[PDB]
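Section 5: illustrative case.
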């Protein structure tokens, strides 16, 4: 496995969690216990909090306001599920404003997410701070989501799980979310999720890497799939 980390001069770590054991792979293992903004990985929590507190539904359509967004791809209507996969920040900023600065702070504290700090602006905190979370915190969190063990209603955790559904290989399923924290120095890269393996075993993962400005968008996922293949968690079909 070991070549395919530095072959690109990457400052990165890959974490796996099986519900008893934490495993660390990569060029820089100490990133695993290091705190970073969640960026768009926070969308997982955001949806959970919104659904649980009746501020949104899995079926509701978030319509485009007509004004151009960061990507032309985002210039359309989205469900929270669609917006999750496209990582459509404007939709989730809206969800967060429905939630509110007091409720969002209370809920994050309630579920112990990262350092539990959001500050004054409810639609910015995951994008620039002060909310921070380690990769180990991220894997445990999604693993808990996978098992329906988070402090949310079971139906809520299920609905979000479905939002995360990325690919099926045979009897195995991949659930994942991406993050790119551009508004921070240095930039940070996330690929987070779990695989529901055929044998019924769940393995949760997190990739956390330094982002050297504008490198390729697909890199985070490609590495994680490669590592997942190398680990025998999610073999290439």
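Designed sequence:
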């Amino acid at each position: 496995v070991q070549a395919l980390f530095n072959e690109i001069s990457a400052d990165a770590v890959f974490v796996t969690y099986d519900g008893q054991n934490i495993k660390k792979y990569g060029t820089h293992l100490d990133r695993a216990k290091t705190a970073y903004i969640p960026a768009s990985t926070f969308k997982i929590a955001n949806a959970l909090i919104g659904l649980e507190n009746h501020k949104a539904t899995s079926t509701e359509i978030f319509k485009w306001d007509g004004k151009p967004r960061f990507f032309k791809a985002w210039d359309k209507d989205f469900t929270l599920g669609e917006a999750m996969q496209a990582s459509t920040v404007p939709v989730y900023q809206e969800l967060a404003r429905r939630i509110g600065p007091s409720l969002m702070q209370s809920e994050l504290q309630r579920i112990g997410y990262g350092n539990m700090q959001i500050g004054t602006e409810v639609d910015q905190f995951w994008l620039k701070g002060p909310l921070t979370i380690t990769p180990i915190q991220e894997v445990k969190f999604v693993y808990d989501l996978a098992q329906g063990q988070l402090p949310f209603k079971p139906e809520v955790q299920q609905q979000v799980k479905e939002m995360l559904y990325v690919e099926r290989r045979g009897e195995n399923r991949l659930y994942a979310k991406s993050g790119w924290g551009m508004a921070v120095d240095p930039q940070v890269g996330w690929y987070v999720g779990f695989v529901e393996k055929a044998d019924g075993q769940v393995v949760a993962f997190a990739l956390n890497m330094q982002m050297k400005a504008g490198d390729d968008i697909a890199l985070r996922k490609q590495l994680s799939l490669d590592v997942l293949d190398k680990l025998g968690v999610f073999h290439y079909l």
